[PDB]
Amino acid sequence: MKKIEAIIKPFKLDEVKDALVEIGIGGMTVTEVKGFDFLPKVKIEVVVRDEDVEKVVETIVKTAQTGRVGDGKIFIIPVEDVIRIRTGERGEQAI
Amino acid sequence: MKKIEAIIKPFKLDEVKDALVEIGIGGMTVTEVKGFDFLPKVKIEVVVRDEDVEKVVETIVKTAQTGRVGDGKIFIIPVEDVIRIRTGERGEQAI
Amino acid sequence: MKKIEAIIKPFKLDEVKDALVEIGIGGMTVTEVKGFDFLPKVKIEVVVRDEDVEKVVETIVKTAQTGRVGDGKIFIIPVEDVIRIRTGERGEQAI
Ligand SMILES: [Cl-]
């Protein structure tokens, strides 16, 4: 599994969120952040199976790219385990 | 060492924080975030020795689980080094 | 590449940000967080080439260290890929 962390322009949040839900993303975490003066951005984090990473990356790029400066970046970070707090299920069972 | 990132319901913050302090957690970072409409959640991050990961995971699960939807998830991410800014100490010496 | 995540005192933000820009950091993400009562802190994230990690760590330590309690910590986390949303460039080309 991998954590996908994307820093995007605030106004692109609803479009990226919808596009991700369309391709089957079960959950996501959003944080208000600042970046580059410091400009407001939105950080999205989703953790997915290794085999779903590329589709997610493509979708975020297609949806948030405007062609102008400050569109953001996407980081792929390794995740060694995921645990669902409600059930205690782990790994694939916890998504 | 591993970074443990848990996304929980806001109201469970004081209980999880206390339970973690009880099992010896020296420090933690908390961020206000939104997730799943977007609902408010609390993100907790602690970085601990490999041998302390499971105890921390169990404690968070026991403390934040309500059995209802949206209890959250816990991600275990690898950390290659930790540096204490005040002293410059690293690794085990920086916790 | 590696993600460098540093939790610092709020007042040190402008100095650390400037010092990092001086050593060639192209971008950074800042989040308002709380840590240790919970005290306000600032989280900085930069993702850099493996060979630039130590210089960045040194710079953050030199700039944010006051010698007092609560100066913070720096975590080095592995990043398997970086994608620039504006162009779709990856890895070294996406910084
Ligand atoms: Cl991370």
Swiss-Prot record, chains A, B, C:
Gene3D superfamilies xrefs: 3.30.70.120
Full protein name: Nitrogen regulatory protein P-II
GO biological process, one term: regulation of nitrogen utilization
InterPro entries, per the entry: N-reg_PII, N-reg_PII-like_a/b, N-reg_PII/ATP_PRibTrfase_C, N-reg_PII_CS
Keyword set, alphabetical order: Nucleotide-binding, Phosphoprotein, Transcription, Transcription regulation
Keyword hit for Transcription: yes
Family: Belongs to the P(II) protein family.
Complex formation: Homotrimer.
GO cellular component terms given for this protein: cytosol
Protein's job: In nitrogen-limiting conditions, when the ratio of Gln to 2-ketoglutarate decreases, P-II is uridylylated to P-II-UMP. P-II-UMP allows the deadenylation of glutamine synthetase (GS), thus activating the enzyme. Conversely, in nitrogen excess P-II is deuridylated and promotes the adenylation of GS. P-II indirectly controls the transcription of the GS gene (glnA). P-II prevents NR-II-catalyzed conversion of NR-I to NR-I-phosphate, the transcriptional activator of glnA. When P-II is uridylylated to P-II-UMP, these events are reversed.
A GO molecular-function descriptor: enzyme regulator activity
